[PDB]
Amino acid sequence: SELIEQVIEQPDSLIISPPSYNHIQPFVYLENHNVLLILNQKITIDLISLWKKCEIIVCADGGANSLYEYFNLQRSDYIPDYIVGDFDSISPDVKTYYESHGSKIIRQSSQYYNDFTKSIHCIQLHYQLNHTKENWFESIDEVDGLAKLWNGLNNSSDVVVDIDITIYVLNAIGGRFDQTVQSINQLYIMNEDYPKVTVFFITTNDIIFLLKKGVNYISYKNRLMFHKDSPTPTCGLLPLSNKTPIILNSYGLKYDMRNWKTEMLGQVSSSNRISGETGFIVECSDDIVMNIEID
Amino acid sequence: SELIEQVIEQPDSLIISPPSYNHIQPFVYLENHNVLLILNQKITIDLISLWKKCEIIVCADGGANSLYEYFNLQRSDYIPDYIVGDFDSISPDVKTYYESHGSKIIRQSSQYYNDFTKSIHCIQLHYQLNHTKENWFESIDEVDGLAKLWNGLNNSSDVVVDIDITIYVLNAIGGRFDQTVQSINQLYIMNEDYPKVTVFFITTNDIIFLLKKGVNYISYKNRLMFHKDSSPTPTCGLLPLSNKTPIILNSYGLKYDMRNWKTEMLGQVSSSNRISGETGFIVECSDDIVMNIEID
Numbered sequence A: 001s002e003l004i005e006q007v008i009e010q011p012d013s014l015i016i017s018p019p020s021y022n023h024i025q026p027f028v029y030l031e032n033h034n035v036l037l038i039l040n041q042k043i044t045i046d047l048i049s050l051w052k053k054c055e056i057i058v059c060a061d062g063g064a065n066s067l068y069e070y071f072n073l074q075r076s077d078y079i080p081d082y083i084v085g086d087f088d089s090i091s092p093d094v095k096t097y098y099e100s101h102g103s104k105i106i107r108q109s110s111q112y113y114n115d116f117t118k119s120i121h122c123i124q125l126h127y128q129l130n131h132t133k134e135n136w137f138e139s140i141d142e143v144d145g146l147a148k149l150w151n152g153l154n155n156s157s158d159v160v161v162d163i164d165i166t167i168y169v170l171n172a173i174g175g176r177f178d179q180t181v182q183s184i185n186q187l188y189i190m191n192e193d194y195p196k197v198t199v200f201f202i203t204t205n206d207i208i209f210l211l212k213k214g215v216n217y218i219s220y221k222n223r224l225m226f227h228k229d230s231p232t233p234t235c236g237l238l239p240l241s242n243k244t245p246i247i248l249n250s251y252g253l254k255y256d257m258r259n260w261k262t263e264m265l266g267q268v269s270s271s272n273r274i275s276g277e278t279g280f281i282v283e284c285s286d287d288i289v290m291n292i293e294i295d
Numbered sequence B: 001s002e003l004i005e006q007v008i009e010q011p012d013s014l015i016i017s018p019p020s021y022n023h024i025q026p027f028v029y030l031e032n033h034n035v036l037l038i039l040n041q042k043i044t045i046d047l048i049s050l051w052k053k054c055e056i057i058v059c060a061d062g063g064a065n066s067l068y069e070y071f072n073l074q075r076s077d078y079i080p081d082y083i084v085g086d087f088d089s090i091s092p093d094v095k096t097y098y099e100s101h102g103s104k105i106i107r108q109s110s111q112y113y114n115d116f117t118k119s120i121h122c123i124q125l126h127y128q129l130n131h132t133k134e135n136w137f138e139s140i141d142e143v144d145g146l147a148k149l150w151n152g153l154n155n156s157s158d159v160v161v162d163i164d165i166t167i168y169v170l171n172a173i174g175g176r177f178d179q180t181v182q183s184i185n186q187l188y189i190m191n192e193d194y195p196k197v198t199v200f201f202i203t204t205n206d207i208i209f210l211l212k213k214g215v216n217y218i219s220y221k222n223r224l225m226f227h228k229d230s231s232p233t234p235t236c237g238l239l240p241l242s243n244k245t246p247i248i249l250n251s252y253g254l255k256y257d258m259r260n261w262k263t264e265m266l267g268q269v270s271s272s273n274r275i276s277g278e279t280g281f282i283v284e285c286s287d288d289i290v291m292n293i294e295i296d
Ligand SMILES: Cc1ncc(C[n+]2csc(CCO)c2C)c(N)n1
Pocket: A007, A255, A256, A257, A268, A269, A270, A271, A272, B086, B110, B111, B112, B113, B114, B115
């Protein structure tokens, strides 16, 4: 708390050279094992382009409707590998359609896990058991079998801890606020327990991800890739965990921070902008969420 | 930390008697110095009904476009009292329109406060100086005059700490994520600094407000006022988004009632909960905590 906090107003363009540090490339999809997780909300992004870059696609219940309604390109060319959840939102017509086309249906009635977490368990269990059994999900407990199987396969130590996964999550932010918060909560929890799983929330307004404790280097070919020709893209660093405060040091943002303490009920960097033409750096005393405006 | 955490599954309908405690009535606007603050996003709700119940209406920059574009039955009958911000989003056409109709224009170029906080300062200063001077905002510092004039006077001098205000904020949630978080951050900050100011974020999906440390009693005529007759009961969540953690919760009237239940980010968080109380419910918390309730 001794070091003086600083906020440096930088020029609109700067060249930041690469800094062990955490390297983040949020916009590769706009050019590891890629996964597309589709939650329940209208799909506005270029679904097709994202789909083509993913190994598996999972729909979280109502998310299947969102996928279905997007084509009304041939709908039959994009069948989700898995459809997971309590199914209190997916419509029979949509359910029938995809089931007849081969989607692996996994019903989980548990009222203690949401469609997002259930879908996440499905994804993790997939990369652990699918190469062994195509129907690994069959006959499992219909209440919370995924949850039990996941955090239970670790007791037998049959879990491959080494596998880099990138999960692109659609429709998880922006809707009901408690769902947005649970999604962020899971983002933090998942990094704590599964640091090799990288999650990107792609929304209508921005891309949201997690900066890891320590140095983070975020790169991209150029800002034009995600910001059509404001002259510069906006961003924010959001201290939403139970670890507070967070000490930030950035290099490449319009309002660069040095030994700047951030915390909810304190100062929070919002409406910041990106000056780095090819990348920027953010060092943090603990994991922290970052959002970057897209288009 | 010793008491056992409990989650009690309750029937879909329960009768909760009132509890000394914080009484919250989030839906009276569907059923007091009311203020309507409009940020920049398309207006989906029944604007006119809310406007009618508000004493003052403020547009945060682009929020003026949102108000203007809403009438695309007479736009001229709804002129905002103030239009505040750096004005990078408001369009000249809209700006000229309301200007000519008497809206009080308060430009603040400061790049260290957003349109929301600037609008909040304007609202607080209004209830302090407006009754004494109609054009109190004139000639103030155009960079951060509102910010300096407020807290710079919020010190035992002219301020009148006794003033109950209810601010209804539109378009503050659901847009760019950093704006959503800054809004929630301010929600927390405002309560500790200005406890008599009650804020309600009205979004396309729910109403969001703050539960105060201690006992909270949320009441309404019936769940029908905010939940049209797939799901029989309205959804809700208790979100621990402050730097005070963990929060111990004790609820009476939710579908999944909590007892001695510790909530925190990176821990367990109550989401997709539901309201069983027919006329209200109780939530006791060890510290302020955010609550959202589905509106449909
Ligand atoms: C670390 C840091 N983050 C953001 C801002 C300023 N930012 C916050 S509000 C606003 C104006 C919005 O109309 C801007 C540009 C800063 N100064 N320092």
